[PDB]
Amino acid sequence: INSDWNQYQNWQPSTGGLKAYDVIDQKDIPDPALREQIIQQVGQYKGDLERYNKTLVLTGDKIQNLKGLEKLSKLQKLELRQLSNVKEITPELLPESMKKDAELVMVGMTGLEKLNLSGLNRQTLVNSITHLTSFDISHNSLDLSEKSEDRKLLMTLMEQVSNHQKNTAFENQKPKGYYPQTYDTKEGHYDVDNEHDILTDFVFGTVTKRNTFIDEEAFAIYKEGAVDGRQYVSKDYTYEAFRKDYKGYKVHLTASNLGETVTSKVTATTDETYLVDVSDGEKVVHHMKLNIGSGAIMMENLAKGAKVIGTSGDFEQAKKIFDGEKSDRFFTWGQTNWIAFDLGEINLAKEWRLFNAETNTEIKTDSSLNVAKGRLQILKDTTIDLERKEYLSNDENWTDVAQMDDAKAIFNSKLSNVLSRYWRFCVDGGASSYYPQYTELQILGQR
């Protein structure tokens, strides 16, 4: 029921109203005009009041008092529109939901003389309230700093009060903290100074609901803030409470060799450039570049989308080494295999990278299925016009340019500035009797 009614609301029901029972009387809502409107909007039964959890729009000059409105404990939004004869709003009149961020709109409240919203954790907030004599917006979660809209609304509330008399409580605010929506640094830089922390340096700080940016020292200055020499922040409100903890924030670093790591630390030993993707845990909140020293030029995977021209195994399967993914593997019924491929043009190859069997992102693959030993190769005849299987199969036409001797999950090594169109990667042996697999092969350099 309760789970169905939760979806269906778009046992008696937890939320909304009673199940399709005494009628709403003056003992609930005294004012006949208010009683009428609430009945039309929430229901005609006593048990509807506690359950109704949507919007209530109160209108007209007929409403004199708002008694009974507190019974709408779950109300998600209250709009007070042109209520010209309403003279008092106290927190005991508003519903409990106001303390948990229910929305509160009021326009044209020309008769209101007392506006008490104290102790409702209001996170945000006046030109129509021209008959104001007292107000209390203390013990809320407001940001009344210099450059805040809420301060400007407070200033109007005070000007309204000042028109009738010298009743203006706005102290003891505990404004809530949020993560900043964007960070400024799009290009960070460090010297080659031989540890820096990317989170503390570039992705840091807390904001209010009005986007006022705050360290501990800045929070201290914020607490000292005041309107008419009256400190508005609650004294007993710790920085530890306000600040965001940046918990489970990860920093994804892609180097010039396109190698990936997850760390906020970088020890600036050598010249380098990283792409930085910072993650809260579910999404990336910031991207930027980070040059260490003079920097380094971003390499490209030259092997990406390379044409297979021969292989000791399945031709169609060999094509999966040069897609973008590690969601499928190449192997053969044996411990040895080779794939020859064509980058289409001659380019400068500076390093290479093999993603081994266990890098598979589709089936949890044990490292015993990894390639233990292999060789990357280039064709000898630099400019031969291929018009083939017997040729590519024959080891004499190939010069090694790299060796693999470790069953690493990912294997990267450097190449002697290799210029070659045609390549071959041979698997020489596996990490066990199980036939070795691998998922992706990169040839890394400048185009």
Q: Of Ca ion, other proteins, none, which one does residue 439 interact with (CB within 5 to 8 Å by kind)? A: Ca ion
Nearer to other proteins, 159 or 362 (CB): 362
Q: After which residue numbers is the chain interrupted with C–N beyond 2.5 angstroms?
A: 10, 20, 125, 166, 194, 214, 387
Examine residue 263 and tell whether it contacts other proteins (CB under 8 A). yes
Tell me which of other proteins, Ca ion, none is bound by residue 440, counting a contact when its beta carbon lies within the kind-specific cut-off of 5 to 8 angstroms.
Ca ion
Whole-number minimum distance, CB 438 to Ca ion, in Å?
9
Q: Which residues contact 46 (CB under 8 A, 6 or more apart)?
A: 21, 22, 23, 24, 28
Q: Does 222 bind other proteins (CB under 8 A)?
A: no
Q: To which residue do tokens 């005070």 refer?
A: 158
| The one among 181, 228, 333, 345 contacting other proteins by CB under 8 A | 333
Least CB distance to Ca ion at residue 301 (A): 12
* DSSP tag of 15: S
Tally the C-alpha atoms within 13 A of residue 228's C-alpha that lie toward its C-beta: 9
Q: Pick what 193 binds: Ca ion, other proteins, none; C-beta below 5 to 8 Å, kind-dependent.
A: none
Determine the 3-state secondary structure of 220 from DSSP: helix
CA dihedral 399, 400, 401, 407 (to 10 degrees): 160
Contact status, residue 68 vs residue 34, Cβ threshold 8 Å: yes
Contact pattern for other proteins over residues 346 through 385, marking x by CB under 8 A: ------------x----xx---xx----------------
Q: With CA atoms as reference, report the closest residue to 62 among 38, 83, 40.
A: 83
Q: By CB under 8 A, tell whether 264 contacts other proteins.
A: yes
Q: Which of 313, 342, 391, 413 binds other proteins (CB under 8 A)?
A: 313
CB-nearer residue toward Ca ion: 323 or 400: 323
240 is a contact residue toward other proteins (CB under 8 A) = yes
Count of residues that interact with other proteins, criterion CB under 8 A: 29
Fill in the DSSP letter of residue 85.
Answer: T
Q: Binding other proteins by CB under 8 A: which of 314, 323, 395, 405?
A: 314
How wide is the angle at C-alpha 30 spanned by C-alphas 29 and 32, nearest 5°? 90
User: Rounded to the nearest whole angstrom, what is the least distance from the CB of residue 335 to other proteins in the complex?
Assistant: 12
Q: In the set 248, 282, 324, 390, which binds other proteins (CB under 8 A)?
A: 248
Supply the minimum distance, in Å, between the C-beta of residue 413 and Ca ion.
Answer: 20
Nearest distance, CB of residue 245 and other proteins, angstroms: 6
- HSE value, Cβ hemisphere, 13 Å, CA-based, for 219: 21
Q: How far apart are CA 402 and CA 422, in angstroms?
A: 15
Nearer to other proteins, 88 or 328 (CB): 328
25 vs 323 by CB, closer to Ca ion: 323
* CA pair distance 9, 2, nearest whole angstrom: 10
Binding of other proteins at residue 237 (CB under 8 A)?
A: no
The reply to whether 316 sits near other proteins by the rule CB under 8 A is yes
Contact call for residue 265 and other proteins (CB under 8 A): yes
Residue ranges in contact with Ca ion by CB under 5 A: 320, 323, 325, 439-440
Considering only 146, 224, 245, 396, the residue that binds other proteins (CB under 8 A) is 245
Min dist. Cβ of residue 360 to Ca ion (A): 9
Query: What sign results for the dihedral spanned by CA atoms 389, 395, 396, 402?
Result: positive
Contact 129, 209 (CB under 8 A): no
Query: At which residue do the structure tokens 């028109």 appear?
Result: 163
Neighbours of 148 (CB within 10 A): 21
Residues forming contacts to other proteins in the complex (CB under 8 A) are 215-217, 240, 245, 247-248, 250, 262-265, 313-314, 316-317, 330-333, 358, 363-364, 368-369, 409, 433-435
